[PDB]
Give the backbone structure.
Amino acid sequence: KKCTTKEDVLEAVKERDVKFIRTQFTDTLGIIKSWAIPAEQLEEAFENGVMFDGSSIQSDMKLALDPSTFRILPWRPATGAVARILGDVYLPDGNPFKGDPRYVLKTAIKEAEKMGFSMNVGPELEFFLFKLDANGNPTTELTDQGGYFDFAPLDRAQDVRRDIDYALEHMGFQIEASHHEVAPSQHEIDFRFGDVLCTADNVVTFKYVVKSIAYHKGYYASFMPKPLFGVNGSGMHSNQSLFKDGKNVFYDPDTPTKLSQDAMYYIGGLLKHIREFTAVTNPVVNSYKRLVPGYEAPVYISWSAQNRSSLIRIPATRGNGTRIELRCPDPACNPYLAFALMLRAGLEGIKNKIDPGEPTNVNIFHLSDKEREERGIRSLPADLKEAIDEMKGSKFVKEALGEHVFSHYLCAKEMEWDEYKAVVHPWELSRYLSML
Amino acid sequence: KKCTTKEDVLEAVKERDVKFIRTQFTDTLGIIKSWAIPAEQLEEAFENGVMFDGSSIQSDMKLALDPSTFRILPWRPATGAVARILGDVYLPDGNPFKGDPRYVLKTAIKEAEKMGFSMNVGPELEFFLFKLDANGNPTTELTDQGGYFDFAPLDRAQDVRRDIDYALEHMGFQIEASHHEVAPSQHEIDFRFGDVLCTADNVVTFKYVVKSIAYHKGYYASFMPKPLFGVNGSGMHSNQSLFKDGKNVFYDPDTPTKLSQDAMYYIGGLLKHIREFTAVTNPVVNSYKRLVPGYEAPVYISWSAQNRSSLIRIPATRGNGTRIELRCPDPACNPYLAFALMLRAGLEGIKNKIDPGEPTNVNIFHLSDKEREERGIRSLPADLKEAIDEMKGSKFVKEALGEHVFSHYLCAKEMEWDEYKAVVHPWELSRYLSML
Amino acid sequence: KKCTTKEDVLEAVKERDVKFIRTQFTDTLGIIKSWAIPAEQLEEAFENGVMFDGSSIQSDMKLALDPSTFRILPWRPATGAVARILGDVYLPDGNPFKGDPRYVLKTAIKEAEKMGFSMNVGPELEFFLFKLDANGNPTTELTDQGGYFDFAPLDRAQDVRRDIDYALEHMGFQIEASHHEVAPSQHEIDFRFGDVLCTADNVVTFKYVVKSIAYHKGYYASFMPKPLFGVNGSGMHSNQSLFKDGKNVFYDPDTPTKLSQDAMYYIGGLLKHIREFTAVTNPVVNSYKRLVPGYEAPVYISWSAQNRSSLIRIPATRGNGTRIELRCPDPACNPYLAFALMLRAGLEGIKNKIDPGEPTNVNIFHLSDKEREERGIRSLPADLKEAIDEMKGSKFVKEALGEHVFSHYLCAKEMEWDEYKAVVHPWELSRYLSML
């Protein structure tokens, strides 16, 4: 069932014999942070909250648990049941901490509600399933050579996949559909189209649930945006819709395309502002190894209805199911920041009535540079450094994320890029050692 | 029992505790495609259908499930039962998608009904049973050195074979007979007569059921037309019969051969048109390593009653069991397209009163080229490129398969052949490195 | 249940079928010492005590068991339950032995009680979790690459950590929180406040309980202050508070910082005297490998409220939760001696009204040597030899610990340092063999 009050949580813990409670939160960079609490401490934690270190996020912070987020993890140790819970971070003086990505998403939700809109997001997460070495360390050994939508694997990896699906279903995730992806040993899982906050929490839970199941079954699940060269990467498309007064606002039966003017303004705002938070949507270096021409990943800023290579795709579904799909993000991104920025950009586009321009129904990759210049088609940042440079001068991103998160994210990404740029890769040795 | 209405399917799911439903369909090239659906979503899927990407077949189409095709897979995971289901593909505007091979077969059946006939097909499927390496990858290691109809194997591979047979029987396949084949580790399974659509669906299910059982028992089942050199290949003979008014059309007690004129016209049409869709019946490059003189595989276009090596053979059975066996296809072919083209060619031959000519009762291989030229005995295409060239100019094949499937199949096969033709094989190194 | 009298202990042993009783005590250097006693001998031991060798501590002594310290160890051998017990050491003439660290702590507690104060300590213990080799010997291979507060590990090491936590809760430790630490494979566990004697006994039990669990699950738990170079070390921070008449002495609502003058004098005394027993707080050579600039370990004598890099930190909590945290000690230290010296230093500071000086709210590591000289920021011993030299001339430490313990500890540490200083390390060979 659904737990609402802390009394319900206590009753569930006593009834099902939950021995340990794990908090759950994410830092600025998207890493999942957690710590364990004994079951007896739960009542005191509900009464007064738990003190902890804010340096894990960014220095003493108080966490106030949220009973509505209580859920039981889908494994049963012989000791007892295990459950997780979320909450809000407060400063010692009582003010909420503005460095929490969840707080950023909540502020974005409040800004949206100020105009009466609410967002529902259904993401599509893709991941790989590799083998483990003799020492249990992760590797890149493939498990099958299947293709798109193939009925594979059929060995024990099939049992592992079925176990993952059943574990996800056991928590009430309400999975839409799961299938093989284009690359070998690549799988995709579609989430139910639902509220944005619950969706972000479900994604965060999903990542480590899948990783733990993969370990316990003897395999490895990876979320790298591009773990292998020559095959498709892993992306996280974000279907979204806005609802006012319980009705979808993107649907307009009186228009030839069955789309309202608000949807046009939303698309225009997203197209205008996507360059600035491309760094947020693609937070690691590998993400830009994924974003290269010649695959399903989009590298040009355009929107279309029938075309699939466009950055923003509008599915043929209409009515209450009308949605807009953004194909840039990858699973390595922080869901809270990405969703908050996407919502804020869409709202700014709607408010300012930004025209999205004509759609691109042709294959952009087949066009020439002169054609792209004539049509005025821009491209996403080529590497992480360019994305950081674009983000630095963006006042909109700074306003949306706040000073603290903006500065910390920029510093961390800058240090990571500086560390990366000075390495000598074996490819350079292979190409240059004998030639020079 | 047999499920006919969605209420029966729901009742069976609730009764036997089925947790996952897997759709089933095949692309143009014959690869089996599928995706999973949670049991709770089944009612909504029945009510409205499921959206999915049509790029797997050939871009968004809706699948409408068919309750009559519901069946439970013959393995019991500890989590719960697993079942599969089939359906029809519809475009968003509501029109059926013409690129589905199942739709092609349905159109062929509709044409046969227009002329008042129905076809029953019982195929003979042959496959190999190899060993897996230490890493679980497929190999070509033999399991026994038995011969034709031998009582082999007798080790644990015998238990694996018996398990395969029992699993097939548990699904209601109603197998006729199963025996060892001529080549070592080669086995054959025969099907009963039934409706052609049901037979194609059964074959499609058969392939992955056998492969899954082979993995789970530690072996590998291969359907390559010719996996080893110097031994017989694997073929899929197709016994067929036309039924009108509940009685066999082919049987005619008044003729000396006990065959009706309609059977003669059917054979004539098949002989006339087989060369054009030989590419469809033999889709991969390896299929033509099997169509070489010196084995049971036929390479000359002829029909006979007593000769066992002819392309078209008439078994001595008469009455309702009267049938025509075509010995060209191999298990790698797409059953839907092959059966549709075969039925259409036979129907055209019946319509046009095509005379099949005199049967060949001698050994064609033992004859000379001058004798074959004198008798006008044509031969099947020697390589995939020749088959593609023959198929490209065939108006009848394009008319039967439709423009979309025709073009996509030709493009895929052309790309595959172009990739293959530029490879340097180790045989060339072994033969020419020292000599030149 | 809380056991008070020996009759309760005997009844519990009979009821729960405890077959073996293990004594528990520590030597001067902090090693845990124990020996086994059959269950039938327990009544005679309670009546008359147990004779044993005092050379293990420092030669015939008598141990008088304390029934209030009876606990049952958290594992269940098939033979029967196992329990541990503590007691006081007496000379044959009946006088208590002054060489027992527990007696030193008891004398410190009595000295505090002379002024009506009582102390509560909650320590934060950090440890590593390595893999065992093929022969079951401790090694230093990491189990995960997690970071601060990361939700790691997710393989069987997760089960090992959960088992450790469950055993600790089962014994009645009342753990506050347990989480991953900054360094890979490093974990931290926090205790609740309690009387200092019980806390020290709990820590001593905790060490070997965790080690035994780690062995029995196939891993190794290490308490080395710095097992790896380039990563954070393991420390044991000590949160302490003084209570008078059931109220917290430190908390003063009237002062702007909400700290009483007594707390200021306590901090002043600690800052004055920390240099002289730094050797006791850091007993081994490796501890001074941990104490290097550039990590969380403090190397300068200072106190701060907001800066968290100081030697003494004041958490933002107030009221009865007011506490003072000292960050120099490491898990290798002897808890009894460390706590006794902390209490003695604090009480001496309170008696003499020592002013703690102005707090340091800036980053000390970023200042220059001239700056720190102007500020008068003194430093901790760089190596064990310097710490021994400082401790030798300390009258306060000698009078606090007694002549016997002082002399024995100095001799042991001097011998260890003399043995260490004459070794030739492989780093010297790597740097100097080729160069010279």
